[model samples]
Target: SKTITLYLDPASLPALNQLMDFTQNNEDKTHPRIFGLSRFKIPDNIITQYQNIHFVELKDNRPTEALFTILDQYPGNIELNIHLNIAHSVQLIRPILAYRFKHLDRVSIQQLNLYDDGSMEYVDLEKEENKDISAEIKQAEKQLSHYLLTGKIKFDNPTIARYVWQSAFPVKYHFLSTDYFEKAEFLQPLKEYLAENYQKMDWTAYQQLTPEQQAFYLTLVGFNDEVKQSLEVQQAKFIFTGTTTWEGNTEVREYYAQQQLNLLNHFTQAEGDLFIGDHYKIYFKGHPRGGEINDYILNNAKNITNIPANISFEVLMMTGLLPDKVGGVASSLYFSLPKEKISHIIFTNNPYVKVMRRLGIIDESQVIFWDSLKELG
Candidate 1:
């Protein structure tokens, strides 16, 4: 599937205009961010190439009109331009359009990210590349290099993982009941009330709920009639398709992309046990920055947002471990585990087994109540 940029929930025309102006006028500065200053260049014919580019502003516009326009203009094989940072409202306006037109080709996108040094960084290692829509790629590249070498602008590591987790992998359908419950008019207030209590949400409060409230909550969490029926009828299947973990520079990445394609061709044999066929639901958990534990959690504070907050849990999964010698500074920290075992224990003694069990990510074995029992087996 080609990458598409989605601008969702754009509030005003000026907000949309600002994005359009930035893309066209700031092409020179943007090139180095995606391709690196040294590697990729904005092609000379950028202006001509982008002439037919369409923004497809969401919100005030309907996709029906936009889709027809695209078909009429391109006719045969159509390609969509970059979906630069899209607006949030775009989601409400074109919810189904994404599912329908997900196959269009996408441009390489490099986000303007901040690095450790607090400087602007590029997503790809070729952080010095630049392209000017008005100028030749070579000319653009030369100018960016001159600016960087002369200290005109500072640089930092901006390499965002090439693929987003959602695009490459499928997470298990572990939908939350909390989201739906928050939408209800009656329970909505209790939801806020419980959240204010934080980790101390009263179990008694849960017990106090009426039969209807309990049923409503059950439905909210996908344990009700509809879910049970669907689960019974469905065969197991892995949701994620193909994904590429880009390695090294351009040369290395291209080589791996080919190998990945080969794996795709003979997916049954190549993927093997991973090819958990359509019988069991398979969920893929992809971390944007692979195995970078520091990036995984800030300090030792666990982010309780994704998982259920009532219970506690820990994981013993393997992050790619590398020896200090093989992995340099960049590779060393980013590619390996902690010198000593980083504590993965949480909720050692919580009484939310009913809720905890539903959260498949947390293993019961790692639920250590006492610090000594938390020892790694």
Candidate 2:
């Protein structure tokens, strides 16, 4: 009566193969039932290993029909769960209605719950009265109920296809690529370029300050606390400032800086909404070391932004390039920030972080993880 659920992805097929081999070779009989999600071309050897197979979302198109027909490989019962929301569901409907199954004892029909985007959650069908229940769902459920009692389905291709033709609606979502950060060196040039731009504006602002007030803003490579506080309080607007690059290859830095100039010049036309706004300021917090780039953009960009008073350092550290190793480095940086200014820090869950925890690489308490099956149960 024990059933083990397995999630299969095309990319992890080879990994699954090894896992199955180990299970069969070890003489394990504990997992004879499987609930497979989506579509996969299971090998004959793998198919024969299981006694009970339940296929979910297997909207049979042609190859799937042949695979199920060959379930003579196993002398066990099969259960097919089909969707009522897609054109391909009709493919399964026509065959099941036409041919009788020798091994299949049950056929479950359900509306599309899992979406195209990475979302898997149930919506209360009865909660909203205005949203009409699609005729396809009602027909599928009607046929399913009738089949359970009479053990037969009548063929109706045109009627079935009409209802199931356009069941799926797209989910609106956008992906932001982080592949460029793979090379730390690529960021070095960007850092220096920002600094050079900042320094040019800093000199212009410095010339306006009187000799007596000059000490309030002058620094070896940056502005003083008074100047920063002044900017934060909006006492007087000042030009942005930047520091020199961290010690490294000057040629590499120069090359990257030029490359950055090209991108920044074309940023508006090329990036679209990728860049926050023309007035938005991006900050790259530099290391405490002398060489790190501490740059700021002025004029169109503003200096002050609202931040929570009691920020959680763990969440902040996880967002950046820092390693998530168990250490005090994060604690050192987190506690150094002003606590009274932050009321609360929100930590968002990411898929990769969830995978890390599921694999036992990270603690469950470390980050929030979304479990679909857990929520469903």
Candidate 3:
């Protein structure tokens, strides 16, 4: 695994000193640095904004180790990049995929590798370590015996993505890398592809990318679009918060649901560590509907509450929605806050509110995920 090289800004004397101080004292919140190619040709220029810190240079592979090392030294908000290459991508992606699958408690593989002519194989590294590799490998062969299987993942039209998280110790990872090529427009294409064949997205679009990029996209898509679609179509009994003029009305409920989803899309775009969860911003034009909805959301919306403090979620409606509305929503913005900071504000809401509502634990019809089965479906 070839390593990515990083250069610290020499001009940031204060930060450089702080870096040294923290590295010496073993502090947290490591500093940010410039991540670039290992080759020295790229100019190591610094903007005045970074004038206070001295930039040091170092290179290494093993993301887990590199991430740990950088935190050990800088211990502050830092912009880091892994000057990644195609080959090293394999190592980078698998752990992330396995991590998500395991964390989400989704799947299990006795053997990662598929048997007989290399079809339907999953490589179970852990099994190999435990000396259960022989049995698992044999099982893989038996399961794959039906068909002549090729590789399960095919990185043909391959793409790579990066995930970043802020707040170490308890880190939050977000999908940070955009299309490697400016013209790649991977997400846009992917979105269109999804619209065309939503259910088929499982292996086609996902498995096409390097394992890393697949894991990266999966965090936002989460489980699958089928789940989201199901949430959107079902009609519910009550609306938690309301649009002023249309309070408790079906139209208002739908509008709020759509807007809520739009904000979720924005957070996905914030494109970085899920831990540093991006900002959720909303600007409202003083229109009666928009203003009412914005108020309701600001008062009721919750994601930055308790436990798992690494990730933060917030929505700030632009002061006046009526004044700015293109019609429905005037303005909105998203902010990524440290979960520790939310404690200062004392918010009690969490993402699972809708989940609870669907189960009928709450008396209100305020469903975050709209149920379609009750509607025109």
Candidate 4:
């Protein structure tokens, strides 16, 4: 048989719950070998009872560390599936490069693709047929491999990790174009700075800086400060800082454009328009998930509202602070929110309620599960 290891965080509990439930009722022919890890406490009995699941709890530890440790027990061909709530693709580079499998069959990352019809398409990272896409992926992997052997992650390595993140899939613009590193131009100047300052960099101390201090360091090291400044104003907001293009398929572009229009209506009626005046800054990592959405909402605001960043329907729903109408990455991120924040969440007759219920993230009385919110009015 084949081995499938699930490298998940609290955000992916719903996925884990679903997988386990299926194994209980149906007889899967594959008898898929599965393993799980989480930062949260799952019932000990659940792990003991599930023959297929070997669940490990990792408290205040890096998933990278936990994953490699688990790999020690299984010593054969493996397919690693990673699901995390973090925004940047670069955050994954270190782990993916650190360990080598006996037969590394495949590596998959979770992502959500929203469409114009208020529907969503889920995307997975796998082999691509396009030569340009494949070549770029190969280049990124090669660089990651080299780093594992001889490279150190200082503040100024000029490693291809930057490009790897910049070219992450689910980036609608990059996906539409043949060129993967479409944002390479933005890094040319930053690359020169890295080459000049490589050896003397003190990334350890830099990493210790507060976000405000780091914002200053970013400009000192030749990165855009706009993103940092934007983050400074929000109480709790996510942003994308990696520089990329706006290229996208027709459906994607139109949908994104309309999301902006919807944002205008939201900010005008609500308050605290995150886009107004000099207050709203952009984070490079904000796009694909946070930053671009921030830009769209702020840029499209028709009137100034005084509401905070967490007030929007999209923010509340996507963050799991409110009930989810959709699923996938968004749901995972939402589930990752603190239980207190999720306690007051509301759900409609959305099909995703069943998934949430199975995951133990929500219960019947917690959500109204409405067929129509308009009907309540």
Candidate 5:
């Protein structure tokens, strides 16, 4: 039987983006129908992917009745897995559904997560593999267990709450994209480093984690995947990225771009390439989820060359679109991109990259640090 997936109000835009990747890549013949109540708009590419979308209009706070209503309509023999991740706006309904679904014999619950560096997305809590503990994972498990046992909420963080439910009762096989799938090659460089420092890993313990969990942990640490000469990057001398983490503040976006420019200039100046000032050709690809700011583009309109805003960074790279140089404030691109095309990556000093450096995931040889740029404010 086809799996029934529920798409609720996601925690953020990236969660939706993750869902899009999930469904598009699914090769199974069983066409899963996604049903949802959405507050944020689903992208056109995402909305059209599922031909069997069973959308509903909830009157208000009625998921209690809605869950059964959807399920009861289906025959009893079919396998049912109701996967969910609802936004905070739908909190009042989630606990009730979690509590009530405990008695449904045919149904199993799973969680969906797609954002980068998030509460539920960040850590591993599988009991068999890991002995060392993290406070965050302990707290997350406690939050989910307490709510299920006592009906008292620990934290209002929607993503974490959803994680709690999944921890208690997730399906055996599920997909966790979490930037880890897209970033898998990023771990390629770590092999040589880890091989030299082989004692650093708990090989027995690390193997115990479900491969999905292990994949995410590795991707989060991040490293270079070899990049080679590319046809697509020829249009520009360098590339810079856009980050949506600022939540679409024009001021913040402009500030980020300015910092990149400052770093680019400082890097050349330090190398005594004085003639490259004010005309360093850079291809700026806007973050698809509204990361571009008008002021930033207008201020340096002539100086900054632009890539088509609609193309994804990964797709462009797959088609061999990569420059000899790239820079960003701790973008996943630094870790996930073609390293060979890049003679050197110009990077800002950020804690994320610091963690990579300190752990030997990346080295000075792969990157150039721009001493003049402070961490993005």
Candidate 6:
């Protein structure tokens, strides 16, 4: 059987990397065909060694049509899978109907869930055991299978979401939990600040622009040796991960930006208490889609180095260069990473805290309340 798959999320590349290894030596009809969406480009540099990586451009809003134009050329048993979150989109329905027809060679339609801890597996939606799970999640799959099988999950509250974690998982529900902020205004200070420090690629480094090669690099807010020198001496490593406050009206968003600045101002005075003694190395990673770092943090927040937002906290852990203490308003990493390697510091009073409690993510008793946190745990 010839296996052809389209990977939706780039964060799940670790799984893809492993699968590619399995089929790496097979010279027969098993060389895998990998596809990704144009809008959400996976950094090519991560897998410059692979072959047959295809980017499916969205033409006239029809992913299946654009997808099939290339798939038609390839014969034999073709496995077409996509992330479960968007399986019910109209752009995908027509194609799914044609391929999942009774006489068609639709071996299986697996739901790929890969947003946890940087590693994941494909769940066969057709499996009997998976047939009657959550009505909301299962509804999409049942609708898909009946037609040739997907949708946005309808988890409106923490109670509904708890089962997803216990039974199965957006593949990004946990991914965005920590992004909750009290006010929309608090979201923007660091964003504009970070944007002000954005850098461009060096033309000198563009010796090779071959279409197949990826040249991804970290565009973190440039910091001087001061930040590095502090880390060099082995100061306490504290990573504060952030998410894009992408929701709300203009007023709310503007307000969020202002509040973000306020947090920066608060940090300036609190740094002494934040750092234990003189040993503290701090770094901030912004949200990949949005949120800018206020220049104040780099300039005044004191000893804070900026890292790339595109890198996930889970991937950062695999590198073996992480600090022993990490805190966030709420990140999947709070529960995802091994407790033995590093201690977790969850912030207080975010609405998502309700979800955290219902899901039993972490003990609330151990929380680091805003006014009370004087030292790192």
Arrange candidates, best TM-score first. Answer: 6, 5, 4, 2, 1, 3
Compose the digit string of candidate 4's lDDT tens values, residues 1-377: 23454534332222233232333333343333333334233345434444544444444323445656655665655544443322233334345445542234543323321111111111111112122433444476566555545533432222333333323332111111111112334334333433322221111343454665444333222234342343335344322111112464556544544444443332223242222223322221222333344455446543332123222222222212232121212233433344444412333234455444533456655454222122110
Q: Write down the lDDT of every candidate, Cα atoms only.
A: 0.26, 0.28, 0.25, 0.34, 0.42, 0.39
Best candidate according to lDDT: 5
Q: What are the TM-scores, per candidate, against the unseen true structure? A: 0.19, 0.24, 0.18, 0.30, 0.53, 0.55
Over the stretch 1-377, how does candidate 6's per-residue lDDT look in tens digits? Answer: 44565543223323222232223332333345545433234445434545655555444333445555566666666555443122223333345345445326634443333222121111111111222233444443334333332332233221222223212221222222222211222323312322322221122221232222111221111222343343455556666555435464566554444443334333333453333333445577654543443332344355677765545454354324467566544554554555554434434234445445533555556555444544321
Once fitted onto the true fold, the runs of candidate 3 whose alpha carbons sit more than 4 angstroms away are 1-33, 36-368, 371-377
| Candidate 5 Cα deviation (angstroms), residue 127 | 21
Query: Model 1 segments beyond 4 Å from truth?
Result: 1-9, 12-50, 53-57, 60-64, 76-377
Best by TM-score: 6
Clashes of each: 33, 5, 69, 26, 4, 18
What residue runs in model 5 are displaced by over 4 Å at the alpha carbon?
7-30, 35-51, 55-96, 99-106, 110-142, 155-167, 170-237, 244-254, 260-281, 289-295, 318-320, 340-350, 359-377
- Higher TM-score: candidate 2 or 5? 5
TM-score of 3: 0.18
Model 5 lDDT per residue over 1-377, tens place: 43566544333323333344343444432355544434333455444544545554334433445555555655544343443332342353454356345545554444333123222232221111223223334566777677666666665343334333335653221222223322434333322222321221111333444555343322322211322232334454666555444445667656666755555444344343222333446556555553444235435544565664434455344334456666544444444455554334444444554444543335755555455444421
How far residue 309's Cα lies from its native spot in candidate 3, in Å, is 18
Query: What lDDT would candidate 3 get against the real structure?
Result: 0.25
The worst-scoring run of ten residues by lDDT in candidate 6 lies at: 117-126
Residue 203 lDDT, candidate 2, scale 0-100? 13
Model 1, span 94-118: residue lDDT tens: 3223423443343222221111110
Worst 10 residues of 4 by lDDT: 114-123
- Which segments of candidate 2 are over 4 A away from where they belong? 1-63, 76-100, 104-140, 143-274, 277-377
Candidate 1, residue 75: lDDT = 33
Model 5: lDDT equals: 0.42
